[PDB]
Point group: none
Chain length 337, copies 2
C-alpha cells in the first residue's frame, strides 16, 4: 500500500490548455490531496516532483518519467490532462496510457479523473471523445476568421476596456494560417497594476478587501462598503452598490474565463449594461477554462461569495447543502440556455 507519484507537464502544441506553471500548480495540489487521503487510509504516498519538458530525444523528461514507471520505481503519474501523453494527435496517447496501466500505474488527470488497469477502457473512450472534439474545433478554426474570432482563437481578450480588477497586456503570437507565417498581437487579462490613490495599492486589493469585510461580518453590507469607500477615498475608476455586486459576480476574479452577458433592448440590440456572466467551460468535462493570470479571489472563496450573494438575494442564508445544490442549479441553467 505504497504510492510513488511523479507529475508530468509540457506546453501544448497550440492545437484549449494551460501553461506549464498552471499545470504544475494543479498537479502538486492534486498530489497533496491524494497524499492526505492515502495517509488517512493508513497507507503511504510519496510525491517525487515534476518532470517538466523544456519549451522547444524530442521528449527526454517524458521518457524519463515513463522509464521510472517501467522499472517499477513510480506507480502513479499525475498530469494536468490526459492529452499531455500525446505526441502529435491526442489519439496517439492510447498506446502509452495502455502500456502504463498494464504495468499497474495509476494515471491521475487533474481535469478528467483517475484511471487504472481496471478502467482502462474509460480512458480509451475519453481519448476518442477528445479526438472527436478537437476535430470539430479544427473545422471551425479552418474557416475564414474575422478580428474577434482570431483573437478568441489565440486566447485573446475580446473587448474594449479591461474590467475592474484587471488590465490588458499585449502579446505577440506567431501563427501559420494557410501556409503563411503571420504575427498577431493579442491582449491578455492581467491583474491590474495601476497605482490607486487611496488606502489600497491595486484594484485586486480592493476586491479582496470587499470579501474580507463581507465574510467576517455577521461594514459587511454592500451599501456600507460603498459609503466607507467614498469616505476613505477608494477611487472609482476615473460607488454604486449595483456596480460592486456586478464585479463580485464576475467569474474572472476567481480566475475563470467568462463571457459578459449584456442587457438587451426589446429590439434585441445589446446595451452597455451588464446583466451577468457565463463561465467559459471545456466542452467534454464542463470544467471552467482558467485565465493565465490566475485568481484574484481563490475559487473556493469565490463560490462561498456567490452563495452569500444568493442568500442576500433570496433574503435568507443557504445551508451548506443548499449552497452546493444552488451552485449546481446555476450550472444546469447555464447549460440549458
Amino acid at each position: 500500500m505504497d504510492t510513488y507519484a511523479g507529475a508530468y507537464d509540457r506546453q501544448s502544441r497550440e492545437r484549449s490548455a494551460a501553461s506549464p506553471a498552471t499545470q504544475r500548480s494543479a498537479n502538486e495540489d492534486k498530489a497533496a490531496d491524494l497524499q492526505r487521503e492515502v495517509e488517512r487510509d493508513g497507507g503511504r504516498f510519496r510525491f517525487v516532483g515534476h518532470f517538466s519538458e523544456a519549451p522547444g530525444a524530442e521528449r527526454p523528461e517524458f521518457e524519463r518519467i515513463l522509464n521510472e514507471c517501467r522499472a517499477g520505481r513510480l506507480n502513479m503519474i499525475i498530469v494536468y490532462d490526459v492529452s499531455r501523453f500525446s505526441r502529435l494527435k491526442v489519439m496517439d496517447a492510447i498506446p502509452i496510457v495502455s502500456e502504463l496501466l498494464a504495468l499497474g500505474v495509476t494515471i491521475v488527470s487533474t481535469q478528467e479523473g483517475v484511471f487504472r488497469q481496471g478502467n482502462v477502457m474509460d480512458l480509451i473512450h475519453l481519448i476518442m471523445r477528445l479526438d472527436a472534439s478537437h476535430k470539430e474545433s479544427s473545422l471551425k478554426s479552418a474557416k475564414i476568421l474575422d478580428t474577434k474570432n482570431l483573437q478568441r482563437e489565440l486566447g485573446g481578450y475580446v473587448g474594449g476596456k479591461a474590467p475592474y480588477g484587471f488590465e490588458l497586456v499585449s502579446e505577440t503570437k506567431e501563427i501559420t494560417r494557410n501556409g503563411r507565417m503571420v504575427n498577431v498581437v493579442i491582449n491578455k487579462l492581467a491583474h491590474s497594476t495601476t497605482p490607486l490613490t487611496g488606502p489600497f495599492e491595486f484594484e485586486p486589493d480592493v476586491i479582496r478587501w470587499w470579501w474580507r469585510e463581507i465574510k467576517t461580518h455577521k461594514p459587511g453590507s454592500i451599501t456600507g462598503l460603498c459609503k466607507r469607500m467614498d469616505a476613505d477615498a477608494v477611487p472609482t475608476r476615473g460607488w454604486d452598490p449595483a456596480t460592486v455586486m456586478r464585479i463580485l459576480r464576475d467569474p474572472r476574479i476567481a480566475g475563470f474565463a467568462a463571457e459578459v452577458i449584456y442587457k438587451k433592448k426589446p429590439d434585441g440590440t445589446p446595451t452597455t449594461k451588464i446583466e451577468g456572466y457565463r463561465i467559459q467551460r471545456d466542452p467534454i468535462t464542463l470544467r471552467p477554462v482558467e485565465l493565465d493570470c490566475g485568481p484574484i479571489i481563490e475559487p473556493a472563496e469565490w463560490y462561498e461569495l456567490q452563495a452569500w450573494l444568493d442568500g442576500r438575494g433570496r433574503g435568507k442564508g443557504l445551508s451548506r447543502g443548499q449552497a452546493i445544490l444552488s451552485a449546481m442549479d446555476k450550472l444546469y441553467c447555464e447549460c440549458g440556455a
Copy 2:
C-alpha cells in the same frame, strides 16, 4: 536477429467477426503464415522459430493468458492470429489495451487477414480496430431486453424494493407490453427499532450530521440496538457505500463495479454515476422520490469527503469538490 512465434486461435463468440473461420481454418492459415515468415527471415539471415498453437477450448481464457505471459516474460516475441479480433474479450475495441501492451514489449503481431503490426506502426492497428468498432456499431443499429428506464439487476439496493410496472410500447407500428421493475422505498418490516430501511438511512444522517458521531460508532450502535443487516455484522465500508448512493437522494444512477485487471467486473461496488439530462445536465429523478432530501445528501457527501481527507471542508471547498466530481462524471 531472433524471432520466437506462437499462434493463437479461438472460436468466435457470437460477436461480429469471421465466424466461418473455425479454429481449424485459423490454425491452418496461422501455420502457413508462420512457414512463409520463416522462409523470409532466413533468406534475410535471421532466425525464426514457430513454437505452435495456443488454442482455446470452445467454451475464462487460459490459453490466451498463457501466450500473453510468454510474451511478457520475453520467451515469445511474435503472436500470429487469424485476425486482430481474436485479441478481444467482449467488443473488438477492448483489444486496444492488450495489443498496445504487447507492442510496447517489442512483440510483433501478425494478422493473417489484416497485416503486420509492431510498435513502429501501432497507430495503424489502433485505427483498424476502431474502424471495426464503428462497423459493428452500424451493423447493430440495423436489426432483446428492457433497458429503457427499468431496474436491470437481481436485488434492490439497501433502502429500496423492486415493484413491477408495465410499459406500453409501439415499435414500428406494433403494440408491445414490456414489464419492468422500478425502484420503490422499501416497505419490508424490519426487526429492531426502525420500521423500514429508509428510516435507518435517515437515522444515519441524523446521528452524523455536523450542525456546529462516527461511522464505526453507527455500526457498533446498530449491532447493539439490533438494527438488522439485510436478511452478519454491519461493516463501515457498507454504510459508506450506501451513503454514497445518489438514489437515496432520489437521483437515478448507474452502479460502477470494481473491475479485475482483465476488465471483467466483480460484484464489489466502486461507486455511482448520476444519470443526467443530456442538455441541462440535471439529474434524472426516480419516480419514488428521495429518502434523504438532495440538499442534505450533498451535505452528506461533503461530510464523507471530509472524513476521507481527514479534515472537514469549508463551505467553498465543499462546493468546489462537488463541482469537481461532476466534471469527472461529464467526461465519462
